Structure 1
Amino acid sequence: MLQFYRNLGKSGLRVSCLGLGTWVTFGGQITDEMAEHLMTLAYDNGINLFDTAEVYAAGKAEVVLGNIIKKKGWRRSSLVITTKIFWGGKAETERGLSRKHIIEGLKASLERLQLEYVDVVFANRPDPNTPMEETVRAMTHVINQGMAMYWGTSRWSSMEIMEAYSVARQFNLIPPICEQAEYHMFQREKVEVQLPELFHKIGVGAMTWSPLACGIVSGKYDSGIPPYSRASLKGYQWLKDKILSEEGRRQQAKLKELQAIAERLGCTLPQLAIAWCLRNEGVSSVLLGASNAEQLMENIGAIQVLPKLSSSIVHEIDSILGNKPYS
């Protein structure tokens, strides 16, 4: 049976199995009014996890997220707000995981969010120019300063996450509680094989992103790049190329076969994809993305699909994908 709320890794932080992200949309692709409606729908449906980053829309995503929280007046204690730090400006010192940028970056993010603290502050990616000890000491400092409750990693290799733990235990600092990693039918290796090891060894939880591979898994690009789609937005040529790549067309081919299973289960492809991401209880929460209310409500409906993901169905999906990693 699905437990809607679960611990993020071994930490005491309880999050909904689904969260709502703000990449591309908040302060960018969608209006603040649409953003307000989406967050309200999420909150009213039990979602307590909202993710953002200092880099999203050059800080505007955080401003919008913060405005909604203040306008709606929801109790701060009922929300789990997370933000990621790494890209905070054009100046040399305004990027990275140095103590200087972690403190300056988080302080600026909190100011934009109109919050005293975030529940989890994440390193948006690894920093090849800053030693682990400095970063872990900085993360520990902002937590001790009450600017964050916990910290986590994103896009870090399992060895790098273990290195952070090593530094934390050697210098009696605070270890990370979660790794925010990409997870969907076409990106499974890290989450299915590596993360479970980190959970058992050092309690690291898995909060996944892009469950629909930026919308690709929806099947919407089955015949070209639809107008208004993310892949058609300015600054997202990389996504369009990926979709139009040889491999991208392959993916669409497999999606048609997966569509057959969805109809069979009585759900949509996106609902099948999102439910699939939560099938295994190694994933603490899946961060959703949505440009409108129809998509968000559809996505939230993935919860009803879970009970239907039998061993046979899963095996059938693995046969189609043909990318089941080795354990």
Structure 2
Amino acid sequence: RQLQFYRNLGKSGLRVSCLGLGTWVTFGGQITDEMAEQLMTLAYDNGINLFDTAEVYAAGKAEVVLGNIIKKKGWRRSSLVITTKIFWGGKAETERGLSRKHIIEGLKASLERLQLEYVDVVFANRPDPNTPMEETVRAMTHVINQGMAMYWGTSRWSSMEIMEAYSVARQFNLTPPICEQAEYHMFQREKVEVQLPELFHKIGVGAMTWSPLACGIVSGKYDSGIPPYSRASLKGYQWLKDKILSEEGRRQQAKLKELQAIAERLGCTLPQLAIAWCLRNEGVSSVLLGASNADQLMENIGAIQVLPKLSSSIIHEIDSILGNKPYS
């Protein structure tokens, strides 16, 4: 009821699967191009139509390999949903932010690297305090009306900024945003559960969550230590290793052992339960995944079978073990 079960992105007419594939650390970096082609073929053959990238990921090499695979395999453009994110574009002062100049130039450079004519959704990656909101909404409306995009959304914004963007768009007869990308897993529960349903009921802005496994923590592989060829053992990721090796990580590993006992009682694995727990409410439209090899992706797709088995008693037991439910 997530992949090859389709639902609207917010209250718009665009329909997506509820599992997507993400173009972070693996693509252009950790894995090769042939493994990336194998992962994209395995995702496309199971009904996943949502793929998400950004211009800062490995300085555009993820967009280059993502544009190579699509042109090689010969898929139709009308059966795919491609998204990009724009905040960081270079070392100069004028190559970052959310001004009109960088939005137009960054979207043109991303479309040139992807070998495409348009994207489906273009995201603002983080808010900009140096630009007025009216300039941002006018630039997004401009690139939609020129045919370089179809929709736009935000990422890591607060509710006041999203409501300000909506009110500016209604004031000047512009185009409001449709979506918001937020972080959501079992140890990060506040924003998606207490702030976003008011916006969804009021102005119809959906949610597309990322990092469901906390970069591999909730998967249960770091209980003994740091295994080789993991994300914590890579160069440039000392912060994740210091997070795992600290005193909070031991309590997280004990709670993960209890949740693994629950998931083994249910008949599945712990990453399948952790992925299917994020989709138990109707305010979340899709979950973006990450995978290093094909066995991880074939295991992660199998949360569809364990999604209808989540009754209220199991959810109450998970909330009793976790103990971090926010107060409304």
TM-score range, shorter chain: over 0.9
| CA apart distance, 1:104 | 0.9
1:126-171 CA-partner distances (Å, limit 9, x unpaired): 1122221111111111111111110001111111111111111111
Task: Assess, with a 3 A threshold, how the Cα gap between structure 1 residues 245 and 159 changes in structure 2: closer, same or farther.
Answer: farther
Task: Assess, with a 3 A threshold, how the Cα gap between structure 1 residues 256 and 70 changes in structure 2: closer, same or farther.
Answer: same
Q: Which moved more, 1:215-224 or 1:284-293?
A: 215-224
Percent identical pairs in the alignment equals 98
Name the residue aligned to 1:190. 191
Question: For residues 245 and 106 of structure 1, what CA distance do their matches in structure 2 show?
Answer: 41
| CA apart distance, 1:205 | 0.8
Structure 1: any 5+ residue segments left out of the alignment? none
| CA apart distance, 1:262 | 0.8
Q: Aligned with 2:225: secondary structure?
A: coil
Q: What is the aligned length?
A: 327
Task: Assess, with a 3 A threshold, how the Cα gap between structure 1 residues 222 and 323 changes in structure 2: closer, same or farther.
Answer: same
Question: For residues 128 and 235 of structure 2, what CA distance do their matches in structure 1 show?
Answer: 27
Task: Assess, with a 3 A threshold, how the Cα gap between structure 1 residues 115 and 3 changes in structure 2: closer, same or farther.
Answer: closer
Tell me if structure 1 keeps the 8 A contact 2:3–2:46.
no
Task: Assess, with a 3 A threshold, how the Cα gap between structure 1 residues 2 and 101 changes in structure 2: closer, same or farther.
Answer: closer
1:85-112 CA-partner distances (Å, limit 9, x unpaired): 1011111111111111111111111111
| CA apart distance, 1:245 | 2.6
Q: Aligned with 1:232: secondary structure?
A: coil
| Alignment map for 1:205-284 (pairs within 5 Å) | 205-284=206-285
Is 1:325 the counterpart of 2:320? The answer is no
| CA apart distance, 1:249 | 2.7
| CA apart distance, 1:45 | 0.6
Question: For residues 252 and 168 of structure 1, what CA distance do their matches in structure 2 show?
Answer: 46
1:238-289 CA-partner distances (Å, limit 9, x unpaired): 2212222332332222111110111011111100000001111110000001
Tell me if structure 1 keeps the 8 A contact 2:141–2:175.
yes
Structure 2: any 5+ residue segments left out of the alignment? none
1:287-309 CA-partner distances (Å, limit 9, x unpaired): 00101101111111011110111
TM-score scaled by length of structure 1: 0.97
Q: Which moved more, 1:137-146 or 1:203-212?
A: 137-146
Question: For residues 129 and 25 of structure 1, what CA distance do their matches in structure 2 show?
Answer: 33
Question: For residues 72 and 4 of structure 2, what CA distance do their matches in structure 1 show?
Answer: 30
Question: For residues 59 and 239 of structure 2, what CA distance do their matches in structure 1 show?
Answer: 19
| CA apart distance, 1:84 | 0.5
TM-score scaled by length of structure 2: 0.97
Higher relative helix content: 1
Q: Which moved more, 1:213-222 or 1:1-10?
A: 1-10
Tell me if structure 1 keeps the 8 A contact 2:263–2:270.
yes
1:205-228 CA-partner distances (Å, limit 9, x unpaired): 100000001111101111222111
1:22-41 CA-partner distances (Å, limit 9, x unpaired): 11011111111111111111
Tell me if structure 1 keeps the 8 A contact 2:3–2:19.
no
Q: Aligned with 1:278: secondary structure?
A: coil
Q: Which moved more, 1:223-232 or 1:236-245?
A: 236-245
Q: Aligned with 2:53: secondary structure?
A: strand
Task: Assess, with a 3 A threshold, how the Cα gap between structure 1 residues 68 and 2 changes in structure 2: closer, same or farther.
Answer: closer
1:58-115 CA-partner distances (Å, limit 9, x unpaired): 1111111111111111111100000111011111111111111111111111111111
Q: Aligned with 2:75: secondary structure?
A: coil
Question: For residues 182 and 295 of structure 1, what CA distance do their matches in structure 2 show?
Answer: 21
| CA apart distance, 1:2 | 9.3
Question: For residues 223 and 128 of structure 1, what CA distance do their matches in structure 2 show?
Answer: 44
| CA apart distance, 1:3 | 7.8
Q: Aligned with 1:258: secondary structure?
A: helix
Question: For residues 120 and 210 of structure 1, what CA distance do their matches in structure 2 show?
Answer: 19
Question: For residues 40 and 159 of structure 2, what CA distance do their matches in structure 1 show?
Answer: 32
Q: Which moved more, 1:246-255 or 1:33-42?
A: 246-255
Name the residue aligned to 2:25. 24
Is 1:13 the counterpart of 2:20? The answer is no
Tell me if structure 1 keeps the 8 A contact 2:122–2:149.
yes
Q: Which moved more, 1:164-173 or 1:240-249?
A: 240-249
Task: Assess, with a 3 A threshold, how the Cα gap between structure 1 residues 255 and 62 changes in structure 2: closer, same or farther.
Answer: same
